[PDB]
């Protein structure tokens, strides 16, 4: 069974998609945190509070609750 | 992860905005959990259809399933272009 451990391998096509969407997520997260706090106001400083704020206020960001606590 | 994510965050926010050393740290950590979570999930979905490996469609389905469906459009075109360059050299 040591030739069947090499089962469920990750393909190149998958490494690709995984990397592409993690970048999309980073941009989504950064941008959502900012819009949600300053709307369309420019030149602002995104602090930690904003990120925990978007994690609090967003259901799809629910899984980040333990990794992005209320207080740093 | 520390370098390429800073460029991702600068690229997403207004060219005049800023992110504290603290916020960027969280974002990076989040990007990590995101990825583990999506793989974890895509892996799950792949077994619910009981097939051996994770397809690009399983990941595409897990994303729409995790409420990140706004992602799927771009990712499919990305996937289209990828499949093309591969079928050449």
From Swiss-Prot, chain A:
It is found in: Nucleus. GO terms for cellular component: CHRAC; nucleus. One of its GO terms (biological process) is DNA-templated DNA replication. The keyword Nucleus applies. Its main location: nucleus. It comes from the Eukaryota. Signal peptide: none annotated. Keywords: Nucleus. GO terms for molecular function: molecular adaptor activity; nucleic acid binding; protein heterodimerization activity. Component of the chromatin accessibility complex (CHRAC), composed of Chrac-14, Chrac-16, Acf and Iswi. Forms a heterodimer with Chrac-14. The Chrac-14/Chrac-16 heterodimer interacts with Acf (via N-terminus). Stabilizes the interaction between Chrac-14 and Iswi. Histone-like protein which promotes nucleosome sliding of ATP-dependent nucleosome remodeling complexes. Part of the chromatin-accessibility complex (CHRAC) which uses energy/ATP to increase the general accessibility of DNA in chromatin. As a heterodimer with Chrac-14, binds DNA and facilitates nucleosome sliding by Acf. As part of the CHRAC complex, required for oogenesis. This is Chromatin accessibility complex 16kD protein. It comes from Drosophila melanogaster. The chain holds residues 29 to 100 of 140 of the full protein.
Swiss-Prot record, chain B:
Keywords: Nucleus. It is found in: Nucleus. GO terms for molecular function: chromatin DNA binding; protein heterodimerization activity. GO terms for cellular component: ATAC complex; CHRAC; epsilon DNA polymerase complex. It comes from the Eukaryota. One of its GO terms (biological process) is CENP-A containing chromatin assembly. Coiled coil: none annotated. Accessory component of the DNA polymerase epsilon complex. Participates in DNA repair and in chromosomal DNA replication. Histone-like protein which promotes nucleosome sliding of ATP-dependent nucleosome remodeling complexes. Part of the chromatin-accessibility complex (CHRAC) which uses energy/ATP to increase the general accessibility of DNA in chromatin. As a heterodimer with Chrac-16, binds DNA and facilitates nucleosome sliding by Acf. Has a role in DNA damage response by preventing cid mislocalization to chromatin. Homodimer. Component of the DNA polymerase epsilon complex consisting of four subunits: the catalytic subunit PolE1/DNApol-epsilon255 and the accessory subunits PolE2/DNApol-epsilon58, Chrac-14/DNApolE3 and PolE4. Component of the chromatin accessibility complex (CHRAC), composed of Chrac-14, Chrac-16, Acf and Iswi. Forms an heterodimer with Chrac-16. The Chrac-14/Chrac-16 heterodimer interacts with Acf (via N-terminus). Interacts directly with Iswi and this interaction is further stabilized by association with Chrac-16. This is DNA polymerase epsilon subunit 3. It comes from Drosophila melanogaster (Fruit fly). The gene is Chrac-14. The chain holds residues 11 to 99 of 128 of the full protein.
């Amino acid at each position: 069974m040591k030739s069947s451990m090499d089962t469920g391998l990750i393909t190149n096509e998958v490494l690709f998609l995984m990397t592409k969407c993690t970048e999309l997520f980073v941009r989504h997260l950064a941008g959502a945190a900012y819009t949600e706090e300053f709307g369309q106001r420019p030149g602002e400083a995104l602090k930690y509070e904003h990120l925990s704020q978007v994690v609090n206020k967003n259901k799809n960001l629910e899984f980040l609750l333990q990794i992005v606590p209320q207080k740093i | 992860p520390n370098a390429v994510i800073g460029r991702l965050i600068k690229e997403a926010l207004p060219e005049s905005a800023s992110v504290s050393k603290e916020a960027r740290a969280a974002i990076a950590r989040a990007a990590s959990v995101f990825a583990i979570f999506v793989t974890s999930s895509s892996t799950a979905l792949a077994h619910k259809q009981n097939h051996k490996t994770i397809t690009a469609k399983d990941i595409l389905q897990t994303l729409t399933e995790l409420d990140f469906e706004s992602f799927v459009p771009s990712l499919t075109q990305d996937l289209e272009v990828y499949r093309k360059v591969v079928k050449e050299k």
